[PDB]
Amino acid sequence: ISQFNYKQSFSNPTCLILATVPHNLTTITKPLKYSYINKCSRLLSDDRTEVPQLVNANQYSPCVSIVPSTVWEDGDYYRKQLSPLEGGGWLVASGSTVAMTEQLQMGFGITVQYGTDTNSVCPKLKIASQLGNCVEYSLYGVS
């Protein structure tokens, strides 16, 4: 799953949260089975050798498009002939299926951008205003 599905960008702060809500998420539907891409590979036109393509960090793999949103069965293989612009050859995607748990479990990867200056994400809460020309800039995102 880290190698061919979701990989957090190391440069951004990385957080992984795994959580299950049994009754709170009534609106959320139950997927038939959890689906992940086991192996993603690209086949050369000669067919002498096939080279696997690892997923880029936080990216949608080209092989992902051939795979349906939910993999039909474990070990399923999806093959398409590549266009001449795509360089020819075939694209092979392998996916596995895990039976849905009684209570849905969802994994969350959170990266908080400390890059740009236009905006800020914080919690909520005259002291806080400009009557305090003494110490402490404490602004939207920079304290």
Partner: protein
């Protein structure tokens, strides 16, 4: 997934003509860092007076780029009805990341309408249309430019006073002059001046009318509309495909005069788009009222380190591409636009490889796959020497439950050339597969 307008209805696509020779006359537009043309502008922080070097997606200096020009309709003298389009639909190209577009480079200038070279019409403001998509395939007719993958379409409306961004997959239409239909010359967009651009009236339905004839849009997960000032002068438009999604950058809002680019809007697309396709747009008009419009120029975006000069006004009027010149490399190093006269060492030339020379029976893996396998403690080791080995076939023969390579690349083991090959085979439990390691705390 809601649709603003009704689906198949009205009439089939108007007859269209491809005239590539008339198009692509070519007017040189090199992008210049010194005039700060096309500069992305660091979205992070801001600087006044201070000059700093920042690494970000940036266009290379001196890049002419790709020029696409829209043209008027066939304009039969009796009837303005009838349309013609360029081959930009079959001009799909692949961009690794990022997009830069220059619009209205020479607006309000003497020009000749593309449809009739003899006819001359003053250059007028116009807005580009594109349908970026990850995968490109041949059409049923066999013409290149059919996107199986989900696509985002940007379409100007009301003579470019409005812009529409919709994430809808295109679907071919059986009607003649349409993609599913046979004998269809090209796929593009059409506009009507009488209703869409009537004075005091702008039609949002103009985008729907183009969809009504050319193609049916499906799975419209995201639909967005942005107003356009359309004052007169035109600046730059930028699309960046970040991991989170596509980002829309509009130069006019932050500074109409400056030409600096800022991120006006954000659109969330999980899919990463690899191919960019331009949809030709043509407006039918009478020969007397034929309109000529400025060409829009497309530039590639590449990660580059750029020295940026920030004015007291806080707008970058000057930039340096460190990669472009040896003097530019010196300017980037010093971090100063001007350097005192001197002789300075710079990166040396490197030889280009030519006249390749290769120095190079069949290692047998049959004992490993034959007989009764040994227990893990009593491992069996096979040594291969003086033989050429193909490891790709071995990997195909046996599915690998766990693959871990230490101090070596998994791809490298198959093709690397070395003194000798060592192979081992033993029986391993799935439960103890986790326990097995090159080094482990477990005994």
């Amino acid at each position: 997934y809601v649709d603003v307008g009704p689906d198949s209805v009205k009439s089939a696509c108007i007859e269209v003509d491809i005239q590539q020779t008339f198009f692509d006359k070519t007017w040189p537009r090199p992008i210049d860092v010194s005039k700060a043309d096309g500069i992305i502008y660091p979205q992070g922080r801001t600087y006044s007076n201070i000059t700093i070097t920042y690494q970000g997606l940036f266009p290379y200096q001196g890049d002419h780029g790709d020029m696409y020009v829209y043209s008027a309709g066939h304009a039969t003298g009796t009837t303005p009805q009838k349309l013609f389009v360029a081959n930009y639909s079959q001009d799909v190209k692949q961009f690794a990341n990022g997009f830069v577009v220059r619009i209205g480079a020479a607006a309000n200038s003497t020009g000749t309408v593309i449809i009739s070279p003899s006819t001359s019409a003053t250059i007028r403001k116009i807005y580009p249309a594109f349908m970026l998509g990850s995968s490109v395939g041949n059409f049923s007719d066999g013409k290149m430019g059919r996107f199986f993958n989900h696509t985002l379409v940007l379409l100007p409306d009301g003579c470019g006073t409005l812009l529409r961004a919709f994430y809808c997959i295109l679907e071919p239409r059986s009607g003649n002059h349409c993609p599913a239909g046979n004998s269809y010359t090209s796929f593009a967009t059409y506009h009507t001046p009488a209703t869409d651009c009537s004075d005091g009236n702008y039609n949002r339905n103009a985008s729907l009318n183009s969809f009504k004839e050319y193609f049916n849009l499906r799975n419209c997960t995201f639909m967005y509309t942005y107003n356009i000032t359309e004052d007169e002068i035109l600046e730059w438009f930028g699309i960046t495909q970040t991991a989170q999604g596509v980002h829309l950058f509009s130069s006019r809002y932050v500074d109409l005069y400056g030409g600096n680019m800022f991120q006006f809007a954000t659109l969330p697309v999980y899919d990463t788009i690899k191919y960019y396709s331009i949809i030709p747009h043509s407006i039918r008009s009478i020969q007397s009222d034929r309109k000529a419009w400025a060409a829009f120029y497309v530039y590639k975006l590449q990660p580059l380190t750029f020295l940026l000069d920030f004015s007291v006004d806080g707008y970058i009027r000057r930039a340096i591409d460190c990669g472009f010149n040896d003097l530019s490399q010196l300017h980037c190093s010093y971090e100063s636009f001007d350097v005192e006269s001197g002789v300075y060492s710079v990166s040396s030339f490197e030889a280009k490889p030519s006249g390749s020379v290769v120095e190079q029976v069949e290692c047998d893996f049959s004992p490993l796959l034959s007989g009764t396998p040994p227990q893990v403690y009593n491992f069996k080791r096979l040594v291969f020497t003086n033989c050429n080995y193909n490891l790709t076939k071995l990997l195909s023969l046996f599915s690998v439950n766990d693959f871990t390579c230490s101090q070596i690349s998994p791809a490298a083991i198959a093709s690397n050339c070395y003194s000798s090959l060592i192979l081992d085979y033993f029986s391993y439990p799935l439960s103890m597969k986790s326990d097995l390691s090159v080094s482990s705390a477990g005994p």
